[PDB]
């Protein structure tokens, strides 16, 4: 039977799913260590920028996790993506350790803004600025990508690198409560939050794992610009940015939230 994470509900995507938005022919580059074939996945394509690790393939386990709340298919097993149904791309920049250089990063990004990809999910952070990923996420920005990083796990009232450039869209963490995660980074470029403990996805090994971290958060904010995007195919990445922002349910502060709860219903309405 087909668990569907509490995450997913809290974000409304079974409310967009009814309606028929699955995130059909849009497609995700999951900037990551790999995506890992399993039964409740498709990946449509790929390419490797990690020296010593060509193939797409997950050693980690972080990005196949990852892809997992993004598109884990709609079926009679496993879990259930936010867009069910989005073309997930598996751009490995990160090697089996969980860490990459600005290099792979930057040339996964202008793969993503070269191949056409609509929206690139970077669930990977430093506290360390980079003027070669800047002009990385802003080359794919103007290519049309629509960049989506995680805001970083240290807890601190600033963000990560890339989320804190302008042209990543920044996603911090929530829990069960709807409280921000005490590891999420929160402050000046956050830009929304979403489901980040708990949460359970797709691992290698034809199996599922329950992982923490505003690297969980993010997928759910790349799905649910599938199923805008699906819904409004002319918008343009800043387009769907700002509209999942004014439809996010507000839960506070958005210095501490952003614009609050990324919430698909809403969005797709
Ligand atoms: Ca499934
Ligand atoms: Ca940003």
């Given at each position: 039977?087909?668990?569907?994470?509490?995450?997913?509900?809290?974000?409304?995507?079974?409310?967009?799913?009814?309606?028929?938005?699955?995130?059909?022919?849009?497609?995700?580059?999951?900037?990551?260590?790999?995506?890992?074939?399993?039964?409740?996945?498709?990946?449509?394509?790929?390419?490797?920028?990690?020296?010593?690790?060509?193939?797409?393939?997950?050693?980690?386990?972080?990005?196949?996790?990852?892809?997992?709340?993004?598109?884990?298919?709609?079926?009679?097993?496993?879990?259930?993506?936010?867009?069910?149904?989005?073309?997930?791309?598996?751009?490995?920049?990160?090697?089996?350790?969980?860490?990459?250089?600005?290099?792979?990063?930057?040339?996964?990004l202008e793969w993503a803004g070269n191949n056409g990809m609509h929206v690139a999910?970077?669930?990977?952070?430093?506290?360390?600025?980079?003027?070669?990923?800047?002009?990385?996420?802003?080359?794919?920005?103007?290519?049309?990508?629509?960049?989506?990083?995680?805001?970083?796990?240290?807890?601190?009232?600033?963000?990560?690198?890339?989320?804190?450039?302008?042209?990543?869209?920044?996603?911090?963490?929530?829990?069960?409560?709807?409280?921000?995660?005490?590891?999420?980074?929160?402050?000046?470029?956050?830009?929304?939050?979403?489901?980040?403990?708990?949460?359970?996805?797709?691992?290698?090994?034809?199996?599922?794992?329950?992982?923490?971290?505003?690297?969980?958060?993010?997928?759910?904010?790349?799905?649910?610009?599938?199923?805008?995007?699906?819904?409004?195919?002319?918008?343009?990445?800043?387009?769907?940015?700002?509209?999942?922002?004014?439809?996010?349910?507000?839960?506070?502060?958005?210095?501490?939230?952003?614009?609050?709860?990324?919430?698909?219903?809403?969005?797709?309405?």
């Open positions: 039977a087909q668990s569907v994470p509490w995450g997913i509900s809290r974000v409304q995507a079974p409310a967009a799913h009814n309606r028929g938005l699955t995130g059909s022919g849009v497609k995700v580059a999951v900037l990551d260590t790999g995506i890992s074939t399993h039964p409740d996945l498709n990946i449509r394509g790929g390419a490797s920028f990690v020296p010593g690790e060509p193939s797409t393939q997950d050693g980690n386990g972080h990005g196949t996790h990852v892809a997992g709340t993004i598109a884990a298919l709609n079926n009679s097993i496993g879990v259930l993506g936010v867009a069910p149904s989005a073309e997930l791309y598996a751009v490995k920049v990160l090697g089996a350790s969980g860490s990459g250089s600005v290099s792979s990063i930057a040339q996964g999910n970077l669930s990977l952070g430093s506290p360390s600025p980079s003027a070669t990923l800047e002009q990385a996420v802003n080359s794919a920005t103007s290519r049309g990508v629509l960049v989506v990083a995680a805001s970083g796990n240290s807890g601190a009232g600033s963000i990560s690198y890339p989320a804190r450039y302008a042209n990543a869209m920044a996603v911090g963490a929530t829990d069960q409560n709807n409280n921000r995660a005490s590891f999420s980074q929160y402050g000046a470029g956050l830009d929304i939050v979403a489901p980040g403990v708990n949460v359970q996805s797709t691992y290698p090994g034809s199996t599922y794992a329950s992982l923490n971290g505003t690297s969980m958060a993010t997928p759910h904010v790349a799905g649910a610009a599938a199923l805008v995007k699906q819904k409004n195919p002319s918008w343009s990445n800043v387009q769907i940015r700002n509209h999942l922002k004014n439809t996010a349910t507000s839960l506070g502060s958005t210095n501490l939230y952003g614009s609050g709860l990324v919430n698909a219903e809403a969005a797709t309405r």
